[PDB]
């Protein structure tokens, strides 16, 4: 019975029942792990066994974090998180650090356990039920449910928000320069000090936390070659926008003229100052493609002029914290990927290009997920919200291995799209 504190009531969105999602196949490695980490959770009684009588459910799986080589159970509370929301976004929304993005180095702490010390609403517990698969279906599923604030449920951080604002009050008044943000199972801490000092100031925050019960994971730095642990920090600077650029030929074949007409045309939706007539006239009648064309002084006039318009921020863009967030990813090729984050169509809020982690193993799947994650992370920092993802892949495939390469406390909402290479709109050169 972990805490005296009075349990706060949670009532899902009206006219919507709890989550009833099925449990996907899990590989031994993950089961074995999931079992153990669950058992010892039942003992201390953070969780409770339950049977068929509970008609709800949610899926779980676990990921052996490379961050610390320690498994982490993961519950896909997306449905539930959705089903309950006057709660966290309205009633008790956690404000955003305008400047968290403006810091030079920012690290993330998995303040997950901080939750296992708050009783979860008496009634609202049936909803968090989950199950554990059995290899070859040797035996039925082992079901459980939460008794304390669960990890990865939009509600937790909101509920705990109070006991957390306090825990940080000191550390913040004795380190005003630092900025701290919490998004679900995480703590975004960012500083302006040398990386060496930051590294420390973080490892110092870790203590202030432990001096309060909040045990944070133990990250490992290896002395062998790829010093991956060197990336742990985030840097909101190598975060450059990715504008579109029009090619540069010396002699423009017919073919080459159209391409540029299309792009210039599409982009017209983004920025309205794109004219094509005076530049498309050059193609007036049914001619071969391979046919060279002399750019008119009236043509090359606006070509190099239109491009002048493709080097700045869009037509007065605004981010409305009340609307959702969308992100698109297009497999550019040879490990490169691109993305745009927008709330409204053609009013992109950010465009960029996730290059590649040398550990891509020539695996688009693996790469894509990483791109999702990466992109996601940026969003939390920048606007403090997760975007819905239009995933350039076939569900059946993505559903088969997105977990294997996944490494996050949270999970973003996604959908699938088979939209071919419209135009090299989002530039590859």
């Amino acid at each position, epitope marked *: 019975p972990i805490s005296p504190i009075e349990t706060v009531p949670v009532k899902l969105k009206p006219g919507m029942d709890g989550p009833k999602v099925k449990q996907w196949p899990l590989t031994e490695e993950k089961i074995k792990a999931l079992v153990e980490i669950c058992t010892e959770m039942e003992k201390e009684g953070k969780i409770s066994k339950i049977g068929p009588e509970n008609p709800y459910n949610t899926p779980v799986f676990a990921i052996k974090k490379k961050d610390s080589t320690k498994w982490r159970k993961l519950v896909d509370f997306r449905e539930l998180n959705k089903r309950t929301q006057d709660f966290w976004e309205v009633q008790l929304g956690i404000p955003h650090p305008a400047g968290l993005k403006k810091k030079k180095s920012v690290t993330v702490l998995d303040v997950g356990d901080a939750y296992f010390s708050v009783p979860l609403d008496e009634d609202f517990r049936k909803y968090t039920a989950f199950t554990i698969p059995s290899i070859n279906n040797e035996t039925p599923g082992i079901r459980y449910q939460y008794n304390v604030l669960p990890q990865g449920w939009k509600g937790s951080p909101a509920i705990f928000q109070s006991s957390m604002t306090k825990i940080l009050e000191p550390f913040k008044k004795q380190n005003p320069d630092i900025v701290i943000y919490q998004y679900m199972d995480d703590l975004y801490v960012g500083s302006d000090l040398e990386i060496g000092q930051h590294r*420390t100031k973080i490892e110092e925050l870790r203590q202030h936390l432990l001096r309060w019960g909040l045990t944070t994971p133990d990250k490992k730095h290896q*002395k062998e070659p790829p*010093f991956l642990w060197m990336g742990y920090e985030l840097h909101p600077d190598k975060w450059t926008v990715q504008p579109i650029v029009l090619p540069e030929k010396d002699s423009w074949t017919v073919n080459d003229i159209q391409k540029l007409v299309g792009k210039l045309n599409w982009a017209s939706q983004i920025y309205p100052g794109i004219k094509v007539r005076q530049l498309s006239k050059l193609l007036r009648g049914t001619k071969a493609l391979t046919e060279v064309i002399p750019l008119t002084e009236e043509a090359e006039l606006e070509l190099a002029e239109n491009r002048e318009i493709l080097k700045e921020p869009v037509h007065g863009v605004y981010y409305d914290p009340s609307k959702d967030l969308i992100a698109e990813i297009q497999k550019q090729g040879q490990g490169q990927w691109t993305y745009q984050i927008y709330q409204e169509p053609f009013k992109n809020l950010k465009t960029g290009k996730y290059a590649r982690m040398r550990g891509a193993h020539t695996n688009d799947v693996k790469q894509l997920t990483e791109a999702v994650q990466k992109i996601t992370t940026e969003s939390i920092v920048i606007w403090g919200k997760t975007p819905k993802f239009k995933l350039p892949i076939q569900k059946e495939t993505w559903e088969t291995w997105w977990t294997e390469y996944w490494q996050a406390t949270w999970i973003p909402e996604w959908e699938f799209v088979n939209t071919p290479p419209l135009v090299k709109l989002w530039y590859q050169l």
Partner: antibody
Amino acid sequence: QITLKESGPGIVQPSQPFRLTCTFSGFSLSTSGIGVTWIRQPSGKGLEWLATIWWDDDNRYNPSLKSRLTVSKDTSNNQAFLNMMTVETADTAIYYCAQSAITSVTDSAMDHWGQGTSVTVSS
Amino acid sequence: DIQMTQTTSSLSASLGDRVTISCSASQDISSYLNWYQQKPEGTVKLLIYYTSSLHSGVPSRFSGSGSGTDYSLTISNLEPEDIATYYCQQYSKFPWTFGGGTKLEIKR
């Protein structure tokens, strides 16, 4: 402004221990990447790696002499030590303690060296 | 116990020259090699780290390269200091290791 100076007994009797001291300045053994390494160099032969002490104390030893080696520090005094048990004539050499540091995801090198101490085993 | 080898032991050249020394490994060390300069005095300095990156405050006439198992250092055009012993260190996997050094002398 970074410097290291090996300290020692320069001469030890066979089968006795000796404890080298690396007094440095210009960097702390607390800052993330940093560490101190101990290179050896017999009279005339080439360079050898003895051991490297890291800030997290995840020290590594030359497999050939782990049984006779032992590294340590005193972060506050900026010193780093290296102890060798049961020495033999073959251990007579010049010992260097160099400031090792992991800079990035790919670079890790012995950026600054000391002048070394001349330890010689002889009854 | 990754054996690092420098076949070229004693190599003599002359001022103005241009030289290249070879440091082989025992297994793909993915460009995790460093280059050290030990003057006759005895001091040891850092020339190159990560097989091709120059250490601050080092003559631009210095460059080395390699990949997988073969790596080599090339001193642009000799000066009177350059004439010294050279070592390459493999840090792809502890235990760390150095070559057998390459003594760079002067032709007379």
